[model samples]
Target chain A: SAPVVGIIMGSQSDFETMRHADALLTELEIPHETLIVSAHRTPDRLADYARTAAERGLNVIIAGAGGAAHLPGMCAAWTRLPVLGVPVESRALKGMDSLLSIVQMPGGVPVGTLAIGASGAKNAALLAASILALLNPALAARLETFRALQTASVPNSPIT
Target chain B: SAPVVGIIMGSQSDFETMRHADALLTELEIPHETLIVSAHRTPDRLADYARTAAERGLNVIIAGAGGAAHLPGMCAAWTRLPVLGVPVESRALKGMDSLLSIVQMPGGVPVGTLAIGASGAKNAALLAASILALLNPALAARLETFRALQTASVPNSPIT
Candidate 1:
């Protein structure tokens, strides 16, 4: 099976937050894969994952890492594929550290970093799908449907 | 001069945000220093600074970086000295990336992350002063004075 989206986290512990990315992509009928690839612990695996991500047919990479969270930025450094970062909540400082690490790519390299925690993960999938939606009419229609559902779910602030 | 507080950013551009930290520290009459210390570009400098920060008689460290902000957590990794992180707003993602990268430290390693951009920088100095206030009653008195002025300056709402 071909996976257009690749979701990688710094550790298995990040699955708790990254599950949202999977669910959103699943809802969109987007084929994706999830795995653990630590930037600090397994630099080799990360390098391999980033370098070969696009060649493997992955259009977008959603990389979530907590703490120093070098995964997304490092991944961006390796591949040309669009990367989105989710800062998983850490023990001490929450997910702020992860967010900064992913979003702040210097120049040339870019990672379309999302929000912290679950919002980030879920948005990453939506954004990933959105990027591909330009070339994919079916996905574009499905995304429109999702967006409609999302908007309908929203309530007027004065009402409720 | 041997300073009581150290405020370092990743680049000179970060000075715009980090200046708030310096201003707050100055307002509190706390001795401090500010400089550029890129973690990715200058890992060696970060190592040297963090390793000797406490020994150099600095009581608190405030590190501000826009992207891939490893400065705060790395500083914490080197010394038990309290480290405060400020996430400067960068070119692409505002400060969302900077915020997560600084706040999400793993277990044991800790970087007390503040709000994003200038507010975070300002608060980092406030928090640093708070930490130092524990031992220095003179500084504590001044902090209380500053807080009093701060509290008075806030409005109750959008009252005309």
Candidate 2:
């Protein structure tokens, strides 16, 4: 199947966090392409990837970065497709820096940001799935099942 | 009296939230200065303001911005003075983007971040007061009073 989503990150190290997005997408049976794309270190690569994402048939882009995270924002700067950001936790400030850099894009450019760390990565994948589900009935059904299971799995009371 | 605190924002629009900090400082009888310094539009201006903050007798800086909030981070990069950040609620994404950007700084440069909108602004001022209280006994006593009043003001039950 052709890839409809793309996931990019700042460095190889980011995969530790970004891998969650991959796993979730895989579990949902959505075809996505994941790769490294640094916004600061490789500005040109980010530009090229974002500029051609639409033509490449990618419907959404999920970008993750930390420590002055710019990958998600810079990616949105070049593409019209929806961009979701995940803030990978950093050694000093957790993922707050990454979260801010990606989420606080100016008025014209927007990056729908999720929570920090693995929770955020998982949510981003879920969000992407929801977006894709808008035009996908089968995906939507699977997503509904996923949501139901999630709701059912939550215990009403905490263990003593 | 010379200014002991500097409250800055990226735009006049930010004053809506940043004003809470200004008013709180005034309530505490803390001498402070407030101004606008856009990190992106006026990078050089931010550089000069942040660099000269400490020498200008500014003990702490409270910076607020929305959408690609770089004001606080950039300020921290320039001076050693403690920089407290307030994430002014943006039109879109509420201040989630603002919160992440300001709170997440590299290890070497730190920006003690507050919450989003007016709460964050007010707390930044309160935090600054706490910091100053360490040195001035009178201010410390006043801060203690302020805390006491805040605690006492809480109602036992909701109006409804």
Candidate 3:
């Protein structure tokens, strides 16, 4: 079966952060493929992945990168498909550099950016699934159930 | 004049972000002192600054740092003074790393964290003034005025 989502990272090291994306997709039953494609080191592969994503039956792309994290923005630039960015935590600046690089795109190119590190990665997967659900009624039903369950989990009273 | 707010940055490069803090304090008519005291590069200076801040008559500390932003946490560790962290946007990850580093401090040590970049810097100054207002009735009055102005500016309806 064709994967609905593409999970591409800037480097293998980003798996530490991007794994959260995979975990979320698994829980949501969203089929996704993971790839090691760097915008700086492997621009060709990155570009190729974005260009051919739609034809391969991929509906959304979740790109994770650190430092000059241009993978998400670049992918958004290449494809009309929705691109969600996860700013993988880096060594020096942590993931602030990656977050800004992905979030602050010029007008016309929109990358729905999430929080940094693992939380961002997890949310990216969920956001991609939500976008896909817009077209897939079954997926949308599942998402609605999931959201209700989530809301139910929150307590009404504050914890002292 | 004695400074009530201390604006410190991790590096000279962070002056751009910390400058927003300065501007905000100026707008609020709050006296402030600014310095470049890198937590990683100049650990000794950072320690000294934090330790002597209370004695220097600083009521609040606004610390801005990019990358693995440690300045806010470290300052909070040393003083009982309220520390507001500004996660300066980085060239790489934006300010996620900075945000996490500032927000995820161990229990007992607390740093009131803000959003990334210039808005965060401005908010830090405002937060500092808010904390200072606890002891100054005049400053508290100013805060009320500021809040009223902000609330009054809200649009009754969204733009068409």
Candidate 4:
């Protein structure tokens, strides 16, 4: 089946962070696919992939990039589909550049952003599922069950 | 007079970010002292600095570091005094690692974390003042006025 959510990383090196997204999608039983299409290194492929995303059967897009991360915002420009950005931690600045670049978009453009690294990547997938659940009752039911399991695990008080 | 607030950076290069903290302290009329202390490069110095902070008449400590950003956490470990952490953007991860390392502490230790970059640095100073205001009435009054001025500047409607 064609992926309903498309997860793209700027470089193969980002696999470490991007893997969290894959794990979350699997947990939710959501259909998705991953790709390595850099905005800076492979501009044409990035543009083509983003421009045709909707027609390719993707309802949402997740783009993870490090450094001056532009893939998320650029993908939003190419399509109206909601884009969730995960700022992969970089070697320097530790993904501060990625977070700012992803979050500080101009007024017209919006990219729902998450924290950096594994948690952020995982949340991006959960967020995508939440959006998709808006249209699918079965997915919504699954999400509710997941939430219940999470809340059930919380202890009432701290043990001293 | 001896410094009441200790502002330490991971490196001399952090002067750019730490300067904002210094400026805020000046605006609040709070006495502060600055230092160049790296957690990775100068572990012993960091340990000694954190250990002797309270005896030196310091009320609060603001530690800013990039990359792994262990300084703030280590400082917290050494003192019962309030520690505010500013995650300076690292070259690689842009401070996500810094933010996680600082914010996600175990239940016992707490480091009040601010945003990333300049805004985070500015907030760290303000947070320090807020903590100090617990015992200093005059500083509390200044903070209230500052907040009022900010509140008064907000517009009720968007510009047409």
Candidate 5:
């Protein structure tokens, strides 16, 4: 089956966070492709990837970046599809710079920004699944089950 | 004037960001007190300060913390006064950990959260002023002037 989602990150280091997105997508059995497309180091590749995303059968694009995270915003600039951003924690700023850069996208071009680090990556995947679920009945049921289980798994009180 | 707004931070290091809140309050001439109260290091001190804030003539509390920032939430837990939080950029995780710890307050207790770093600190002061302005007409007029001046100061086009 052809991929419906594309996960692109700034560099290899971002994969540490981005892999969560990949794992969630896999758990949901959503066909997707992941790649390294740096907005700074590989501008053309980013433009090309985003520009061709829809035509390539991708419905959503999950972009993860750290530091001066320009990948998600830049990706959204080229594509009209819904773009979700995950702010991978960085060394110095720990994704503050990344979150601001990705989240504070100017009007007209929108990027649905998630939280910073692992939870954010997982949420992005869940959010993407949600969007996809709108059109697919089978996927929607799976998502509902996942949510119910997650809610059920939480205990009422903390252990001393 | 007796202080009405109390600005507290987890540690001296947080002063870097919380200073903006202090300066903004000063500029607005909003009577406020600045202090260091660590929620983790000195739990009893935090409890005492928060429990006594309202009785001491403080109407609003601005608490800033970095990393596992719990000052704002803990303060809110002890007092009925509106507590505004500022996430100071930390050494490691930046302010993501701080923002989560502050913003994700449980039900019944609420902490009005601002952004990360300087912008957040500044906004927290402005928010405090906004709250104070509701009762004091003269301060309301001053706040309106400050907002109008700020809006008017923005350039139509960037200098090339």
Candidate 6:
């Protein structure tokens, strides 16, 4: 199966947060690839990843970073693909800094930023599967089933 | 008069958000200075600003950035000033990315991050003032007065 989603992160340290993306993508049955690509340490690698993204048949990109979370925005700069950013919780600010850095792209580029930490990562995979689902009725139906299951799982009353 | 608070933003666009900090500081009668300092484009300027902050008579720093917002954390890296981060609402993600980037810092350095957009901006000033007020009993009492006024300003009922 061809990879439709490219999931990248700033460092190995980000795996604790970005692993949510991997898990969701796997659960959704979306063909996705994961890699470590730092903006500060590996700017060239990011440039290469984004530049050839579409050629690799990647439909969406999900990038997560903690401090100076620049991966998503910088990825957007090089490609026209829809990029989603997940802000990993940091040691000090607890992902607030990561959230701001990834979400606040300038006018031209766009990165569909999600919530901080795990929730954001989970949503990123869901959003990517959605984009790929647009031309994929089968995928779309699966998505609906997944959502229905999720909605059904929620209890109306208190947990206690 | 010497300024105790230094409110800096990445660009002029941030003023819309950072101005809340200014107004809050003004409302609290906290002497402060505001300037544009890009953590990306003007790294040297931010380094200089943070390194000499204390000597310049500034006790705290309130930094705002949208989209890869590195201003707050980077400022913290340069000095020990209690820096508060405000994530400005961006074009794409509505400041979620900004929120993470500013709040998430590596261990050792710290940046007290606030919410997104204008509310976060207001709190940054309030938080900075709170830090400044620790040693100044007069400012502390005035802060309490302002907070009381704030508490009294909230509406009790819904529109319905």
For model 1, residues A1-160, the per-residue Cα lDDT tens digits are 5999999997778999999999999989999898988765555577678888888999999999887787787677678888888878777767656655766668766778888999989999999989989989999999999999999998777653
Model 5 CA deviation exceeding 4 Å by range:
B1-160
lDDT against the true structure, each candidate:
0.83, 0.86, 0.85, 0.87, 0.90, 0.83
TM-score for chain B considered on its own, for each of the candidates: 0.94, 0.97, 0.93, 0.93, 0.98, 0.95
Q: Chain A only: give the TM-score of model 2.
A: 0.96
Between candidates 2 and 5, the one scoring higher on lDDT is 5
What local lDDT does model 5 show for residue B64? Answer: 93
Candidate 3, CAPRI quality class derived from DockQ: incorrect
Candidate 1 Cα errors over 4 Å, as ranges: A1-67, A71-100, A108-160, B154-160
TM-score of chain B of 6: 0.95
Instruction: Please report how far candidate 3 places residue A112 from its true position, in Å.
Output: 1.3
lDDT of 4 by residue, B1-160 (tens): 6789998887766778878888998898889987877775567777888999999899999999876788899999999889999999865556777789889989898899999888888898999999889889999999888889999999999987
Q: Which lDDT tens digits does candidate 4 get at residues A1-160?
A: 6699999998888989999999889899899999998999899998999899999899999999988999999999998889999999887677878889999999998999998888789889989999999999999999889866754543322121
Summing lDDT over every window of 10 consecutive residues in candidate 3 chain B, give the lowest-scoring window: B90-99
lDDT of 5 by residue, A19-134 (tens): 99999999999999999999999999999999999999899999999888999999999999999999888877767888898999879999999988887899999999999999
- The reply for model 3, stretches above 4 Å from the true place, is A155-160, B1-160
Give the fraction of reference interface contacts each candidate recovers. Answer: 0.47, 0.39, 0.09, 0.16, 0.06, 0.46
Assess every candidate by TM-score. 0.58, 0.58, 0.51, 0.53, 0.56, 0.56
Candidate 3, residues B96-143, lDDT tens digits: the string is: 768888889999999999989899998898888888888889989998
lDDT of 5 by residue, B1-160 (tens): 9999999986667888888999999999999888878776567778999999999999999999887789999999999999999998865576777899899998999999999999999999999999999999999999999999999999999988
Give residue B139's lDDT in candidate 1 (0 to 100). 91
